From a paper:
Phosphoprotein phosphatase‐1 ([name]) is a key player in the regulation of phospho‐serine (pSer) and phospho‐threonine (pThr) dephosphorylation and is involved in a large fraction of cellular signaling pathways. A tight regulation is therefore essential, and in vivo the enzymatic activity of [name] is restrained and specified by the formation of holoenzymes. Besides this layer for control of enzymatic activity, acute activity control of [name] is also provided by post‐translational modifications (PTMs), especially by phosphorylation of a conserved threonine residue (numbering 320 in [name]α, 316 in [name]β and 311 in [name]γ) in the proline‐rich PxTPP sequence of the disordered C‐terminal tail (C‐tail). The phosphorylation of this Thr by cyclin‐dependent kinases (CDKs) represents an important control mechanism for cell‐cycle progression and neuronal differentiation, and it has been associated in vivo with an inhibitory effect on [name].
For the phosphorylated C‐tail, it is possible that the negative charges of pThr320 promote the formation of new interactions with another region of [name]α, thus inducing a closed, inactive protein conformation. To test this hypothesis, the [name] variant of the most abundant isoform [name]α was expressed, purified and crystallized following a previously reported protocol. The structure was solved at 1.9 Å to determine whether the insertion of a negative charge in the tail induces a conformational change or leads to its stabilization by binding to the catalytic protein core. Similar to previous structures, no electron density was observed for amino acids following P298 in [name]α containing Glu in position 320. We did not observe a significant change in the kinetic parameters between wild‐type and [name] enzyme in either of the two assays. This shows that the introduction of a negative charge to mimic the phosphorylation of Thr320 does not measurably affect the enzymatic activity in vitro. However, the introduction of phosphate‐mimicking [name] mutations did not appear to induce such an inactivating conformational change, as the phosphatase activity of these [name] variants was not destroyed by trypsinolysis. This conclusion is consistent with the crystal structure of [name]α‐[name] obtained, which did not reveal structural rearrangements. According to our findings, the phosphorylation of Thr320 is also not likely to lead to a folding of the C‐terminal tail and its binding to the [name] catalytic core.
Residue numbers in the entry: 8 to 298
Write the structure that this text describes.
Amino acid sequence: NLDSIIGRLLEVQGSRPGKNVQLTENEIRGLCLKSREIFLSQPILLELEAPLKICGDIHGQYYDLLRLFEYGGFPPESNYLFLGDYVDRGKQSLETICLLLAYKIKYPENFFLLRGNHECASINRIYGFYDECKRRYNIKLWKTFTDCFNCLPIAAIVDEKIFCCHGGLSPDLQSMEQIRRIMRPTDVPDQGLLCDLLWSDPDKDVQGWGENDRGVSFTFGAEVVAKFLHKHDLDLICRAHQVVEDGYEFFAKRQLVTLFSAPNYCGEFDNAGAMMSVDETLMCSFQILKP
Ligand SMILES: [Mn+2]
Ligand SMILES: [Mn+2]
C-alpha cells in the first residue's frame, strides 16, 4: 500500500513542525525489506545521469525534507540523489527515512540514497535513532532498519564527471574498482576505504592527509582534491557531512562542494539548507532554503 503510506506521510504538509506520522510496524518493516532488495540489486557505486537534484544531510528534520521537495519538486517531477545522514539528532528520523524509502521503492530508477556515517547501528545507537525506534516501535524494528542501512550504496558518479559521497576522499582510494568490490551488507569499519568515504573532511589548513578531529578517518587538502580529479578525469567532488552557513560551500577553487540540506541544523546553527541541481549540460545551480 505504497500510495497510502506516501499520502499519510505527506498529509502533514504545511503543518506546524513536530506533528508526527505514525505508520504501522508492518508498513515500516515492508519499506525496509523492499528497499533493501532494490539497494542490493543496484550497484554500490551508482552511475547516474543529469538532470538530478542533489541533497545533503537531513538528520530527521522531516519538515525540512518536505520543504526540499516543495522547492525541488515532489518525485517523480524531479530526480533525486541524497548523500546520507537521514537519521539521528532531529525529532522525526522515522518520518524522514520512511518517506525516502517509500520514494526509492516507487521510483527506483529516479530516486537514490547514499549511505552516510549515521546509517550505521553503532552511531545511531548514540545519536537518537535507536531511542526513537524503541519508544515509538521496538528494538527489532531498529535492527530491521540497520540491516537495510547496511545495504545502501556508498558513492555515485554523475555523467562520468561528478563524484558524490557523504564524507570525502580516502588515501586508500586508488581506483573506482575498489569501491565496486566492497561487499554488502557490511557494517562501517573503524578504518579503511569505506570508513573514509563516509567520514573524511576537506580542510583548508592541511596539505595532503591530516588527522581528523572527529577521531575517525582523515582530513584532506586542496592538492588531494586536484590530483584526484585529474587522475580520474572528473570535474567535481560533491559531498555533505559538515554544516555550512550558506547551505553549500566550495573548496579547492570550486573543485569540491559541500552540500547541507537541514536548515537551522539541530536548532543550534542558523544555517541555510541548499539543494544542487545538475542539468543535462552538467551545469550546477543551487536552490537555497533559509531557516
Ligand atoms: Mn551528518
Ligand atoms: Mn555526517
